Amino acid sequence: MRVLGIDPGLANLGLGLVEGDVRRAKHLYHVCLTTESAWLMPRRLQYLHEELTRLLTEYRPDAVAIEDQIRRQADVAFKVGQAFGVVQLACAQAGVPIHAYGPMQVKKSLDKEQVIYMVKASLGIRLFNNHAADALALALTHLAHAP
Template sequence: MLGSQTKQVILGIDPGTATMGWGVVRQEGSRLRYVQHGAITTPSGWGMPRRLDRLFAGVTELIRGYRPSAVAVEELFFNTNVTTAITVGQARGVALLAAYRAGVEVFEYTPLQVKQAITSYGRADKRQVQEMVRALLGLRSIPRPDDAADGLAIAICHAFSHRMSAATGVGKPRAMQDN
């Protein structure tokens, strides 16, 4: 059986300062099981340091509660809106820091890699990705909010990438290095 020895809990994170989506899946061999999803939100009236502190505390709490063996985070997508890119980068940074401090290995995936893994088409639209997340995890409806569905998609992407590299011995999902 493909990847029959693999058992892991994966926390997927879709970074954002207003809403940080997350999803947890459990991989047992070739089976993927839904665990939970949600979002960490911060009020728009809060200053950036307070928002980042809330996000850090939230991710830390998720790691303590679900005890993932891997955290998969979406890489920053270059956006023409520089302000948005900077704030998403800050949110991404606190997620990476929380995982690092907890001693959990972190993996990064581009939006293109996530779409390719979930739908087999790197240019799939958001609705196609959400529908495939629903189908792959056997859920009755598309996870809400959208950011949480994205968090699940990132976790699934890691599970698929990890399973394929374990089964074939070729390639390895790119873990962030601690240099």
């Protein structure tokens, strides 16, 4: 019933918490974590894991939904992959099962911003930020797919 969606990244990390059924979803919480530029990789990784860990303990989600990985550049893919493993580790440390959905799949379940208005409508709020918006989108998308 409660689900955490994560827009993964290193410079940005979008997190979104919603709760409810397939017909009805209650928005709980959303934020975009931005680790700044001039920190060593481990320091950035420490901030993302600490903050993520803090939110999984309190909100106690029952599922984590994560965006499937798409980018042709390899150094970027390695940097993005480091944040992805630290996110996958935090859930495992919390015991929260992690389901993966593709960008198209979330678009099916709800230049192009239609998606943003569908999440806003189903949670009855107002999202300026593009990263917290997709995380909520993934959280809503898990509810539809969930049996």
